[PDB]
């Protein structure tokens, strides 16, 4: 019955946009879902409880002497469509380790058994710009059985997307972390549905979903909530609905076939994106050729 | 003699672009340079080598059984104008450290004699995206005294940008890394130039150089090189010069003073990047207000 997810990416491609709106989609369905935050800007959970960011673990142990002096109800908060709302936090930017505050986080919230609820799903929303500390902890302990991966057609984006996929291959001994698929938050760039896609069959996943860039999701962001609750019949609003049937419904959960930087900068070229190059003129002035 | 300085920003901002081809404009102006790079992505010293990704130290050391057995000649490449070439790498995406490879990278360089060559100066290239193991070793341990940081006018660029800066004024009372400046990376927004200088009057520091988005990069990097080199007479190349030119006399080394959250947004909404909000909207629906 329950089934843990994970929302992986590159810095600012849209994975709070994105989890939260699919996860308000899921509460109009009738799940009953959990959000932790995963990354150190803690506002993957700003939409859903209609705030500024979260108080985060980090901040109320700090305030209260440790994590072992939290209540559950202090650190989880119930928003729209009652999802459940948690964020990790984290180390000041000089110190220590970025994503520690994850480790501390999902170790309180099974402590304090906020698994054990009648929980559908649980979606952790995970910086993936370097996949090592408590960010690569879903992974390589078994707490995320569903990694989607969200990116574009860009080159960080996609290079994100595949570094990802090399830690869901380190840990496919060790547990049933799989990739589900890869969700392009478009740019408005001209092939790029296609080239996620293409980058998809590479992995050996899917592209589950393109959702559209549209401005509802900044005219729902003012008033602080998600375009699923702001305008409920924008068009935007069936984009991430659509997300969240083919997520629900979605049984293609793979080890990933990670592709080398030639591959990846070839899918580029394929697709328009990044211009041919020819081992020729390599080294060669403007004015030689 | 010897300044030693340090590129952070955010992934994708342009700091590899930024770095070469202002290391290519100071060798072309007879100054000698060492770009270390401490991004796992291995791709910091391409335009000055004519090369695909430059043999890291972390794979020389994995494929030889130690450090101990490498040779710095294999680890440290001269390329255009004499600019000496090193690459940290990194660890596979789902075990330890992403920051590991800069550790050992800077220990080796140590060791190996390379900071006393009459180098007029040296560049670290370096993931700002997280703030934390070998990332933050530049800044923790008293190795690049002028960070310079390249960010735009996007909220991610610019929250990477606040903390570095608050990484910085960590290890203040440490050593002597001070913040030297901001480098806008155009990504052809409106008031871009504007919002930048006036990130950087509430940091205490300055926007050093605009840099103009130009296609003749993609030209210049399609022939696997900077544009200093593939077309001196361009005007990005003039750019890139007068970049290294307010560098060399870049004499602004402050302690950050780091802005809020809110700050940062108040500052998007100033500039027209983000829009304007408030709170009798927070929480109605699209029927409401
Ligand atoms: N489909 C979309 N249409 C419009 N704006 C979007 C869309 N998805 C995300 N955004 C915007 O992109 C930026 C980053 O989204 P965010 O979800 O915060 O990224 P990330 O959590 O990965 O850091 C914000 O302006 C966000 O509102
Ligand atoms: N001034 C510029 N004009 C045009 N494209 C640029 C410019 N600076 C960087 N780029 C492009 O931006 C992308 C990222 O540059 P890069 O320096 O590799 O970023 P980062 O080192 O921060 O990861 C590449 O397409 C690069 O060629
Ligand atoms: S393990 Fe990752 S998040 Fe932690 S200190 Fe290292 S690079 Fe930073
Ligand atoms: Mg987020
Ligand atoms: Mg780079």
Redesign the interface.
């Known amino acids: 019955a329950m089934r843990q997810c994970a929302i992986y990416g590159?810095?600012?491609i849209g994975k709070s946009t994105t989890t939260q709106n699919l996860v308000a989609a899921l509460a109009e369905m009738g799940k009953k879902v959990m959000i932790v935050g995963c990354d150190?800007?803690a506002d993957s959970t700003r939409l859903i409880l209609?705030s500024?960011?979260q108080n985060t673990i980090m901040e109320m142990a700090a305030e209260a002497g440790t994590v072992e002096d939290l209540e559950l109800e202090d650190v989880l908060k119930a928003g729209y469509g009652g999802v459940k709302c948690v964020e990790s936090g984290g180390?000041?930017?000089?110190?220590?380790?970025?994503?520690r505050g994850v480790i501390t986080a999902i170790n309180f919230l099974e402590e304090e058994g906020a698994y054990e609820d009648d929980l559908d799903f649980v979606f952790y929303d995970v910086?993936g710009?370097?996949?090592?500390?408590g960010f690569?902890m879903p992974?390589?302990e078994n707490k995320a059985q569903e990694i989607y991966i969200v990116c574009s057609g860009?080159?960080?984006a996609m290079?994100?997307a595949n570094?990802?996929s090399?830690?869901?291959?380190?840990?496919a001994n060790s547990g049933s972390v799989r990739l589900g698929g890869l969700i392009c938050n478009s740019r408005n760039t001209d092939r790029e549905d296609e080239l996620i896609i293409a980058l998809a069959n590479k992995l050996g996943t899917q592209m589950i979903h393109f959702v559209p860039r549209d401005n509802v999701v900044?005219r729902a962001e003012?008033?602080?909530?998600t375009v699923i609750?702001?305008?409920?019949?924008?068009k935007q609003a069936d984009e991430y609905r659509a997300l969240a049937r083919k997520v629900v419904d979605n049984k293609l959960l793979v080890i990933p076939n990670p592709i080398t930087?030639?591959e990846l900068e070839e899918l580029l070229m394929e697709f328009g994106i990044?211009?041919?190059?020819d081992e020729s003129?390599?080294?060669?002035?403007?004015e030689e050729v």
């Open positions: 590159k810095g600012g150190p800007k209609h500024k960011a180390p000041e930017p000089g110190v220590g380790c970025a994503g910086l710009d370097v996949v090592c500390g690569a992974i390589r860009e080159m960080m290079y994100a570094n990802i090399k830690g869901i291959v380190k840990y900044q003012i008033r602080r909530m609750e702001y305008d409920p019949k924008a930087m030639d990044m211009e041919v190059e003129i390599v080294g060669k002035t403007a």
